[PDB]
Design an enzyme around this catalytic site. Sequence first.
Site, PDB file in Angstrom:
ATOM      1  N   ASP A   1       0.808  -1.228   0.000  1.00  0.00           N
ATOM      2  CA  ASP A   1       0.000   0.000   0.000  1.00  0.00           C
ATOM      3  C   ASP A   1       0.841   1.278   0.000  1.00  0.00           C
ATOM      4  O   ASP A   1       1.936   1.316   0.561  1.00  0.00           O
ATOM      5  CB  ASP A   1      -0.961   0.006   1.191  1.00  0.00           C
ATOM      6  CG  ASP A   1      -1.083  -1.354   1.848  1.00  0.00           C
ATOM      7  OD1 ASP A   1      -1.178  -2.363   1.117  1.00  0.00           O
ATOM      8  OD2 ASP A   1      -1.083  -1.416   3.096  1.00  0.00           O
TER       9      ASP A   1
ATOM     10  N   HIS B   1      -0.730   4.841  -0.071  1.00  0.00           N
ATOM     11  CA  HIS B   1      -1.336   5.939   0.673  1.00  0.00           C
ATOM     12  C   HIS B   1      -0.975   7.288   0.058  1.00  0.00           C
ATOM     13  O   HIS B   1      -0.540   8.203   0.758  1.00  0.00           O
ATOM     14  CB  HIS B   1      -0.900   5.897   2.139  1.00  0.00           C
ATOM     15  CG  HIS B   1      -1.417   4.708   2.888  1.00  0.00           C
ATOM     16  ND1 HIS B   1      -2.694   4.650   3.403  1.00  0.00           N
ATOM     17  CD2 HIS B   1      -0.828   3.532   3.209  1.00  0.00           C
ATOM     18  CE1 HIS B   1      -2.870   3.489   4.009  1.00  0.00           C
ATOM     19  NE2 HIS B   1      -1.752   2.792   3.906  1.00  0.00           N
TER      20      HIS B   1
ATOM     21  N   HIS C   1     -11.993  -1.283   0.160  1.00  0.00           N
ATOM     22  CA  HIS C   1     -11.953  -0.048   0.937  1.00  0.00           C
ATOM     23  C   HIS C   1     -11.790   1.162   0.021  1.00  0.00           C
ATOM     24  O   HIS C   1     -12.344   2.231   0.277  1.00  0.00           O
ATOM     25  CB  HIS C   1     -10.816  -0.093   1.958  1.00  0.00           C
ATOM     26  CG  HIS C   1     -11.271   0.068   3.376  1.00  0.00           C
ATOM     27  ND1 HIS C   1     -12.420   0.748   3.716  1.00  0.00           N
ATOM     28  CD2 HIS C   1     -10.730  -0.362   4.540  1.00  0.00           C
ATOM     29  CE1 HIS C   1     -12.569   0.729   5.028  1.00  0.00           C
ATOM     30  NE2 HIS C   1     -11.556   0.062   5.552  1.00  0.00           N
TER      31      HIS C   1
ATOM     32  N   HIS D   1      -2.552  -4.260   2.493  1.00  0.00           N
ATOM     33  CA  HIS D   1      -3.462  -3.651   3.459  1.00  0.00           C
ATOM     34  C   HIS D   1      -2.855  -3.578   4.867  1.00  0.00           C
ATOM     35  O   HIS D   1      -3.541  -3.265   5.839  1.00  0.00           O
ATOM     36  CB  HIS D   1      -4.800  -4.400   3.467  1.00  0.00           C
ATOM     37  CG  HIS D   1      -5.879  -3.711   4.238  1.00  0.00           C
ATOM     38  ND1 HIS D   1      -6.252  -4.101   5.509  1.00  0.00           N
ATOM     39  CD2 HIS D   1      -6.677  -2.665   3.921  1.00  0.00           C
ATOM     40  CE1 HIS D   1      -7.227  -3.322   5.940  1.00  0.00           C
ATOM     41  NE2 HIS D   1      -7.503  -2.441   4.992  1.00  0.00           N
TER      42      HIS D   1
ATOM     43  N   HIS E   1       0.512  -1.850   6.853  1.00  0.00           N
ATOM     44  CA  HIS E   1       1.621  -0.909   6.707  1.00  0.00           C
ATOM     45  C   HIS E   1       2.984  -1.556   6.937  1.00  0.00           C
ATOM     46  O   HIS E   1       3.958  -1.221   6.268  1.00  0.00           O
ATOM     47  CB  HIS E   1       1.463   0.269   7.670  1.00  0.00           C
ATOM     48  CG  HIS E   1       0.222   1.076   7.450  1.00  0.00           C
ATOM     49  ND1 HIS E   1      -0.109   2.158   8.234  1.00  0.00           N
ATOM     50  CD2 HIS E   1      -0.768   0.955   6.534  1.00  0.00           C
ATOM     51  CE1 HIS E   1      -1.254   2.671   7.811  1.00  0.00           C
ATOM     52  NE2 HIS E   1      -1.671   1.961   6.783  1.00  0.00           N
TER      53      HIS E   1
END
Lengths: 366, 362, 349, 349
Positions: B8, B10, B88, B193, B195
Amino acid sequence: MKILHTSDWHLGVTSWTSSRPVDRREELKKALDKVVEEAEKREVDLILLTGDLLHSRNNPSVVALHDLLDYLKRMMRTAPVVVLPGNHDWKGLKLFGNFVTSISSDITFVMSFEPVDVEAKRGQKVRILPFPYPDESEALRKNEGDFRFFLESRLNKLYEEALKKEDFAIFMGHFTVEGLAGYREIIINRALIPSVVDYAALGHIHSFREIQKQPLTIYPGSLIRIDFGEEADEKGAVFVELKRGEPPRYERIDASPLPLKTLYYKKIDTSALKSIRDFCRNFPGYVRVVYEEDSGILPDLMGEIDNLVKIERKSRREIEEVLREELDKLDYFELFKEYLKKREENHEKLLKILDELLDEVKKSEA
Amino acid sequence: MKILHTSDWHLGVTSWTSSRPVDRREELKKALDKVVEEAEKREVDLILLTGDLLHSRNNPSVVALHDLLDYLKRMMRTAPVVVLPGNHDWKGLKLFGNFVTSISSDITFVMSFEPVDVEAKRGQKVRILPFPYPDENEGDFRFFLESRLNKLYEEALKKEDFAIFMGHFTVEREIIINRALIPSVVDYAALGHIHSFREIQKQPLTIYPGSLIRIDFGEEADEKGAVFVELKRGEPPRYERIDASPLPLKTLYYKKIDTSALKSIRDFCRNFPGYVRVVYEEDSGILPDLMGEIDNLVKIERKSRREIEEVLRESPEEFKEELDKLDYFELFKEYLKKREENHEKLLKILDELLDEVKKSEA
Amino acid sequence: MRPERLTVRNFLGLKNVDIEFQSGITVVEGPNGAGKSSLFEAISFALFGNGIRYPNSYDYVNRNAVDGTARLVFQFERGGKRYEIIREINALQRKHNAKLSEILENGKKAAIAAKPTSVKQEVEKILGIEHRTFIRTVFLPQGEIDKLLISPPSEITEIISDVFQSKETLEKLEKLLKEKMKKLENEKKLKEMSDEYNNLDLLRKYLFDKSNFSRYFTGRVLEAVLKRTKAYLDILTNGRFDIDFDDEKGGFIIKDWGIERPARGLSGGERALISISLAMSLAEVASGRLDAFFIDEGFSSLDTENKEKIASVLKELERLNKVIVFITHDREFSEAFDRKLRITGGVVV
Amino acid sequence: MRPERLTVRNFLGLKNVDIEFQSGITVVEGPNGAGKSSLFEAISFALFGNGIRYPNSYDYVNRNAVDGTARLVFQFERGGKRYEIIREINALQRKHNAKLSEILENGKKAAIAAKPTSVKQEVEKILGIEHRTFIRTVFLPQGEIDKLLISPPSEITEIISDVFQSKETLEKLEKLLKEKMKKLENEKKLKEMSDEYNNLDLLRKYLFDKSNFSRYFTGRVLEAVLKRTKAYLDILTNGRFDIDFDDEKGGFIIKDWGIERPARGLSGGERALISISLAMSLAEVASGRLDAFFIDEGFSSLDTENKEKIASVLKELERLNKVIVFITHDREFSEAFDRKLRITGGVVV
């Protein structure tokens, strides 16, 4: 080459939300279907999309987007499509379209006054002369001078770039041609449009309108009657055909979307009610009743009649505006003479004796 | 074939908005850059994207979208990319991705539990076994999940060359999934999903690549970066880890902020390239505006003595344990013995001198 | 060791005190000149037999009681088996008694030594700590601790010297060795003499030179003491402080968050924690692990406001679980320690 | 024509009335038996000289005035040039006078006829409308109008028959033709007689056969009256009601929004508008365009609540701009028409 041209769809557009909300999506899909099917059966070479493809330009529903991309694919399956999105800026959609343009030949989002050279299904070299709405802010000061001069400058630019064509050159524009019923907008003079183009595909107008024949300028209009202001319109795409040796020719493809009908009454009374009920019951489309003198209280036709979308009250002045002789007299004797003249071999022979009988009755009376 | 996998991202994620907002975008780009550059220099064959690629799943900024698509292109320039977006993430990203999938081979958005057969840079036939967040009551949900796995298994056996499982969940609202439930016949299971990087298991090789930047202090002790896995037919999977190089975090813990504490914070933040969070227990002012002065002091908190000890963890090595105590002469006895060919003799005359002094003392 | 109990009577500075050490950090305080300093002296005299104030055993009797004996018992865990020792001593009688009875799981005391000389041998045999070292280890005088911290490298190597070994013993070995050489130099047999001289004189030089053995020995403290000092500064400071040593600089160079800093710059409570930590590290590298410590307040004139602050910052020492007792003289330091013990007029109130 | 003025004196039902017609609908009401019905009679009399109620001219003198003459003037536009006519008639004198003087742009009247017989000829020559037809055209009795609407096909073809031509004249032509045939049948010359018989008898049959000409004439009513009826139902109903006639079904097919519907189903005001429209259409297809109409209220027993509603719905007739006057008997109908004219006791109040 053969071309299917389509005008703004208004996907996911809900009609008459103020009176009785109707989800046009179903109908709208059926018309698109019929249009696409005609494009395939006709083996077109190029497909053009203009005007408002999505109804909501600030917040398109997910489904509306789903449908748009759905039909963009179905479209590409038949021939390369070129989309000219106008005055539309949601969720960097213009950004989306730009990205796909770059990764594909079967689709091309034109979104700048700068020309692009696409290539048709059969290999025809088409040069698009774009003229969308303008990005960024011109400002109030520049519109009176900057706004018209700037537009003029763009046209002079499209002209020069149009002459440098290879095979065909199609102009695409998102604006309002000066001289229309009017339905911020961009007004553009017909003379301002390049004459050297083989076809000028316009959009952003619900009703179909062939502006001019040289260069062939057309507004395809919507595929469904969005409101009653267009109940007398034919809805569908336009199938143009450009050839080198001969001038442009174009048919119109009938979408056949549900029809509209306005029923006009002086006053809603027992007779009126029966009339409305009787009509709506045998009408596949949507109905709007309009009246002048008040008949209130009024029964809930909408609750009873499920296809009565709107009930309005136009003034006698307005109902006449929107709605857009001597009589011959014949005496019985003359009609008689006339009859004895067509339904018999010889007329005169009977007339002479008849005038003698008329003379005898006239004299033997005074 | 060579695979570069990145967890991920972000994008457009603003950190510490409650205390001092920091636009991570700059840093986040620099890490992505380093990652992509490593992918090219390594000539990978396939690129996998999973987890939260966009920070905001309900309202991604325009720039955030711009960056995402930007790096999707840079990614494709090196090798075919396969994106598994978790549920999500915002919806227009699913319809979009689907459209591009259809018009291209260099990219493929998998967004359904149904398998897809992609094709690698060097032509390798990879079969993706997807398992996204089930979109659109708890006992039936687990039954539903278990059924999909049985499905992915059957479809995995019918592979050609390689078969990579891709999943968006939490290994045992969130979706809990048992490790045993994952297909064993897959050559690699790319997850996301999470970190923090975590190698779940080695068979089948299951990995969470984790973020490329430390999003918060809850991960200041983490290494950030992608994972470069390599599948071969004859041999088992092998994988390195590509270091991102993202700005570091540091928590300074104090009992109470006083004149000494203040000097300590100032001195440290001044020589620290990353972001700093000071935590304290005892009431201490009345504190000056450190954030106002120290521009890289992102957060000032107050952990209880109970909590500050729990989060600290345990570092008991070389402590509370017996220490080899050595006396002065036995160390002399030892230093001499090690440093001379013949020691025993000097050792003997020493103990004799010691005996002589002992006796002449009492 | 872990002092569990210490019943003192008529021991110098004390009349009748009953102390029971408990888990944590205790603080004993009383009217100046009584109880505070004398209480510990008593504990160090219950082990071997020689305090630290007077040489002769009998001098340790309280002035307030003449012709009367001074009794003191002492229980202490050390090795998983607790021991108990009770000595009595009367100036008048000219007789001193003792007994090292170990406390069994059964609750019955077992004999280990009868004479005071026997109890000394046995106690020193326990954890290999001679009275000489014990005095310089479990008892940490604040004045000397803080001094060791900001001490120069020469004065530091000295401190390390006179804690692992008596300076006197070294000087005596010195003179004896020099005397043997003089004997040899003055006087088959001649070859054996030349072999002995060279060999005895060489060893001499090895032990004698500061540059070699003296230098290496100092390393053990820096390599061992620091090693352990770091751990203490971690459990007490949460990894904030970390000190090391360097000749080039002043000496004990101290770092705060990887950044060195003058020790004078630290607050009192930091000087205390860091200094005490290094001190326990030295004490333990010399005498093995210790489960107790005695520290008395130094009351530096400018250290008063700090007295209340230092008390708060030193409270972290409780986390070590060692039996740490403070022998403070001022009330301000004494107050902020839940567990207090006041000794007024020889008795405890 | 367009009646502009009508000054009546001592004419039956009236004593002294002065009316000035105005654009739009005009309504006149008064105590039953006077003014209302008699006023129109006067206007019919002023033109030709026969009226409707009585045969003999002199009978048209008011009962209230005996041995006194009845004077009536009348101005009326017809063809862009307005005319004026004044007849007087005294029962006692046994003399009747008249004069058709046309009103010039100059304002001076020009002579066209002196004797009452001359004024009749000249008037009938204007717009080719004989008194016989005029009676059955400009005057529309509500009772007969509404009846024509929901009338059967046989009774309809009859109505059309006795409006374009007198039934009596047809019967007389009948008998005369039959008499000629009898003469021939009873009696070169013989060949001429046989030629005349066959030819006269054939024409006879062509006239007589309701099957053929009478049918086509009825067609004239269909093709032309409906043609014009549709236009009226458009300007008054805004394209709502369209009327067509089918013989087999019975009556006049009536459609509301493309959907046929029983005429009984319509509200009173709709029956009125639609019926009156068809009526003007017939009247005009027989007598050319008309710029005026007289309609008197029928007062059907169950039509009272409607009287007030019908008044509102009929007000649309004003849009035609024709001079339309209502001869109502009830007050409720009379009230809702801005322009009223009450005639009480022969005079106007």
